[PDB]
Amino acid sequence: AKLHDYYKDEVVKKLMTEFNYNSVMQVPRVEKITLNMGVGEAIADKKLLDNAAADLAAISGQKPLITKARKSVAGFKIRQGYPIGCKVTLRGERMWEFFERLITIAVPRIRDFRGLSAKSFDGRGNYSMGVREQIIFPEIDYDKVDRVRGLDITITTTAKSDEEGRALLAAFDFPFRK
Amino acid sequence: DKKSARIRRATRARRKLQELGATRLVVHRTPRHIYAQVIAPNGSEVLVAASTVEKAIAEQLKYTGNKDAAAAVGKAVAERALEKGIKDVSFDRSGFQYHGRVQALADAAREAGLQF
Amino acid sequence: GGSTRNGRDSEAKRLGVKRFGGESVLAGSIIVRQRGTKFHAGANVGCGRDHTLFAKADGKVKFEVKGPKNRKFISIEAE
Amino acid sequence: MLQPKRTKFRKMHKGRNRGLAQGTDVSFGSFGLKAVGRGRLTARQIEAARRAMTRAVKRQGKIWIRVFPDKPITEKPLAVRMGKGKGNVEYWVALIQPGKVLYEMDGVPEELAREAFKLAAAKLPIKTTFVTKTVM
Amino acid sequence: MFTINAEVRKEQGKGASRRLRAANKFPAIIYGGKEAPLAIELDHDKVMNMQAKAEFYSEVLTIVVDGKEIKVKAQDVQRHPYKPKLQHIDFVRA
Amino acid sequence: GIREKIKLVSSAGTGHFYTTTKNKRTKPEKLELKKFDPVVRQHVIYKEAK
RNA sequence: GCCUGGCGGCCGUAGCGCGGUGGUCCCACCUGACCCCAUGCCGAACUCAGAAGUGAAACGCCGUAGCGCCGAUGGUAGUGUGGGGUCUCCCCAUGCGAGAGUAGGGAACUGCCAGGC
RNA sequence: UCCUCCUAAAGAGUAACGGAGGAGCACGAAGGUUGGCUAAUCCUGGUCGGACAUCAGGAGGUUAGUGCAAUGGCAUAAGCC
């Protein structure tokens, strides 16, 4: 593990040179990465969610758990906390464990891209990267590609503005450009 | 908010402890210290005091908030209660679950005679 | 129609007013929900799952200003 | 537009006129119309006033209406006995008292506001009075 | 500066106020300035024709109250829904 | 109702029994529950229909 | 008497919103969770092991009195009780009298206990 | 027949084929409890793609929920686990 150690020394610890604070403890931090994988056309049975979560847990270090629904989804018979997908939310060391597998070894299904925008916005500085699939990691034999399954990513941080979060964006090796 | 979450874990217990009354024992946690006080049935007096801010014991600690220091305070509350003739006490878990430093104090005090 | 029915009684009863009781029991009201307007606080007790307060005491009722969660409550009289 | 909406009840008590009002002076504008009399003021009576006052200020300023109807008039069917529930709606109406201000203007000269509010001294169940902000 | 004469009243309420307004005066008060409130009667039209010129709310007034001078400021005035010659009036000490 | 009743017998060997309306139309797996037996004053399974 | 803490009384006229100040001793954040315990996964939480940093967030105290809240006095609304009216609210005599606004108040207090002074 | 508000007079019952709406069955669970937990709605942003539609962040708050219409307690949750 090297990328979280880079976050402990090389990221925002000199930010007082560019951003105004009353304490050096105000510099921005990463809180969580929620994640999402959609059940798609299996929504009306969804007993496969345990078997889909188990293969997200093949690139994540977390133990699988199943997403409960909110406000229902369409007319598919979704009621209260009905199990409907997977998040398997990342905190602490597990966030950068994943960002040392993502587009380092998990590569053979990526799309044509070269750099995501740094001047992007939400109002707090919480960045996102479009990937659509779990993009596959290579094994000694596979025999693993049939549908690959989905992936969505948006970070959550202590930042109060989009240019404060632009200094925290330094926390990753993913292609972002100024 | 943890100050607010603590009173959500405590109000229901206080709302049955008020139906017992009598001479009562309360505990105060914090992460760097621990304290306890015995309060009178009139609501106007304090009968026994002990803590890890007490100069006699603070010098004996490797850490002023430690579980062993909570048991050491518990054994002192029961000692002082015995010399002051205090019995049949009502215990308050003071917003904390009965396995942490709150129990380490109150159980050690009860095995030192202070029922509860 | 034309409005229909409009049911009988809708019974609701009120006892917790002035120096009520003084013999063996003091009372609140029958209003389907009650926890602070005519309720007990401190060492006083008299209410269960039915939300009608009936406290078992020879103390008369007493009224006083405020109590826990800024609710009004009712108290007992010493003699 | 000049009618109660997002309500849960459709019919109201016929009512008596006892309200004293606090709509007793021009609120945002400079010139207006005061009731200076008592009774019922209908949607029809204010339509007749709107049609009239518009002829003095044909292309001149915005006009504001300070009165609003809160009560519908209900009347029973003709070929039916007493009882069987409250009657069917006809028109919307407001109760009025002498102190109440009904209309406001601002984007015109004071002698053109008078030209419109003197024209309103007609077609109404009260003998209205023209009023203005003044200095005090 | 708008010298008006103020006599002190030891009557109060609806019956007295109606009996006052039926004459040449209407009810008024003076308060503030670390001194008690004072209930007075004032001229029912002189004050209306003065305050209508608005500088009454821009200047310190030369009132004569219980025979004597104190200087006062116009604070607030109470109007009647349809009777133009005032309902009640407030002053504060200067 | 159309959900029917089930009558279960005491595992204390008593003639006194227990009866309930437990619906099978969504949840068909059998009812086999503990209750207080009023003839021996014990907490026993009530089992097997009729 | 004050600084902080716990509690009993008191429970928001201790709420809303914007600052100052300080952590000495308090306190919270914060630090560790290879070894007790714990997580529908997650050291977030619970619990254990703590003093490297912050004084920001929060906290205590105080400041800003615009709002919520208290509140004179006068007046009005309403009406106990008598009497009257071209009239369904309106007048007289006598008792009562809001609510909202104005002056003034208001940004919790205080005893017991250990500790900072 | 049962059941609910307004009208209905600051003690209390209360008329009208007055203003207006429901029940006639379910639940071993939503029951017992120790502990733990805390919305709606509006907004910003979405994907291989949408007749419907993801999880976050921003605003907000006894506005969600309680087996069922209706109202009110409600986090000590009586809401769910």
UniProtKB/Swiss-Prot annotation, chain A:
One Gene Ontology term of the molecular function aspect: RNA binding
Modified residue annotations for N6-acetyllysine: 2
Signal peptide region: none
Family assignment from sequence similarity: Belongs to the universal ribosomal protein uL5 family.
Functional summary from the UniProt entry: This is one of the proteins that bind and probably mediate the attachment of the 5S RNA into the large ribosomal subunit, where it forms part of the central protuberance. Its 5S rRNA binding is significantly enhanced in the presence of L18.
Protein name according to UniProt: Large ribosomal subunit protein uL5
GO cellular component, one term: cytosol
GO biological process, one term: cytoplasmic translation
Note: Identified as a multicopy suppressor of the slow growth phenotype of an rsgA (yjeQ) deletion mutant.
Pfam family name, one: Ribosomal_L5_C
Cited PANTHER family: 60S RIBOSOMAL PROTEIN L11-RELATED
The species this protein was found in: Escherichia coli (strain K12)
Domain of life of the native organism: Bacteria
This protein's UniProt keywords: Acetylation, Ribonucleoprotein, Ribosomal protein, RNA-binding, rRNA-binding, tRNA-binding
Subunit description: Part of the 50S ribosomal subunit; part of the 5S rRNA/L5/L18/L25 subcomplex. Contacts the 5S rRNA; cross-links to the P site tRNA. Forms a bridge to the 30S subunit in the 70S ribosome, contacting protein S13 and S19.
NCBIfam families the UniProt entry points to: PRK00010.1
InterPro entries, sorted: Ribosomal_uL5, Ribosomal_uL5_bac-type, Ribosomal_uL5_C, Ribosomal_uL5_CS, Ribosomal_uL5_dom_sf, Ribosomal_uL5_N
Alphabetized HAMAP family for the sequence: Ribosomal_uL5_B (MF_01333_B)
Curated annotation (Swiss-Prot), chain B:
One BP term from GO: cytoplasmic translation
Region (Required for binding of the 5S rRNA/L5/L18 complex to the 23S rRNA): 1-16
Cellular component aspect of the GO annotation: cytoplasm; cytosol; cytosolic large ribosomal subunit
UniProt entry tagged with the keyword Ribonucleoprotein: yes
Gene3D superfamilies linked: 3.30.420.100
Keyword Cytoplasm (UniProt): no
Alphabetical keyword list: Phosphoprotein, Ribonucleoprotein, Ribosomal protein, RNA-binding, rRNA-binding
InterPro entries per record: Ribosomal_uL18_bac-type (IPR004389), Ribosomal_uL18_bac/euk (IPR005484)
Matching HAMAP family: Ribosomal_uL18_B
Subunit structure: Part of the 50S ribosomal subunit; part of the 5S rRNA/L5/L18/L25 subcomplex. Contacts the 5S and 23S rRNAs.
Assigned protein family: Belongs to the universal ribosomal protein uL18 family.
Protein name (record): Large ribosomal subunit protein uL18
Organism, as annotated: Escherichia coli (strain K12)
From Swiss-Prot, chain E:
Species of provenance: Escherichia coli (strain K12)
Entries under Pfam families matching the protein: Ribosomal_L25p
Transmembrane segments: none
NCBIfam families xrefs: PRK05943.1
GO (cellular component) term, any one: cytosolic large ribosomal subunit
GO molecular function: 5S rRNA binding; structural constituent of ribosome
Role this protein plays: This is one of the proteins that binds to the 5S RNA in the ribosome where it forms part of the central protuberance. Binds to the 5S rRNA independently of L5 and L18. Not required for binding of the 5S rRNA/L5/L18 subcomplex to 23S rRNA.
Alphabetical keyword list: Ribonucleoprotein, Ribosomal protein, RNA-binding, rRNA-binding
Keyword RNA-binding: yes
Keyword set includes Protease: no
UniProt family annotation: Belongs to the bacterial ribosomal protein bL25 family.
Oligomeric form and interacting partners: Part of the 50S ribosomal subunit; part of the 5S rRNA/L5/L18/L25 subcomplex. Contacts the 5S rRNA.
Record GO biological process: cytoplasmic translation; negative regulation of translation; response to radiation; ribosomal large subunit assembly; translation
Record-given protein name: Large ribosomal subunit protein bL25
Curated annotation (Swiss-Prot), chain F:
PROSITE patterns in the cross-refs: RIBOSOMAL_L33 (PS00582)
InterPro entries per UniProt: Ribosomal_bL33, Ribosomal_bL33_CS, Ribosomal_bL33_sf, Ribosomal_zn-bd
GO biological process, one term: ribosomal large subunit assembly
Annotated Gene Ontology cellular component terms: cytoplasm; cytosol; cytosolic large ribosomal subunit
Coiled coil location: none
Keywords: Methylation, Ribonucleoprotein, Ribosomal protein, RNA-binding, tRNA-binding
Superkingdom per UniProt: Bacteria
Keyword Ribonucleoprotein: yes
Gene Ontology MF terms in the entry: structural constituent of ribosome; tRNA binding
Complex and partners: Part of the 50S ribosomal subunit. Cross-links to the P and E site tRNAs.
Alphabetized PANTHER family for the sequence: 54S RIBOSOMAL PROTEIN L39, MITOCHONDRIAL (PTHR15238), LARGE RIBOSOMAL SUBUNIT PROTEIN BL33M (PTHR15238:SF1)
NCBIfam families (UniProt xref): PRK00595.1 (NF001860), rpmG_bact (TIGR01023)
HAMAP family: Ribosomal_bL33 (MF_00294)
Family, per entry: Belongs to the bacterial ribosomal protein bL33 family.
Miscellaneous comment in the UniProt entry for this protein: Surface exposed on the 50S subunit.
Protein name (database record): Large ribosomal subunit protein bL33
Source organism of this protein record: Escherichia coli (strain K12)
Gene that produces this protein: rpmG
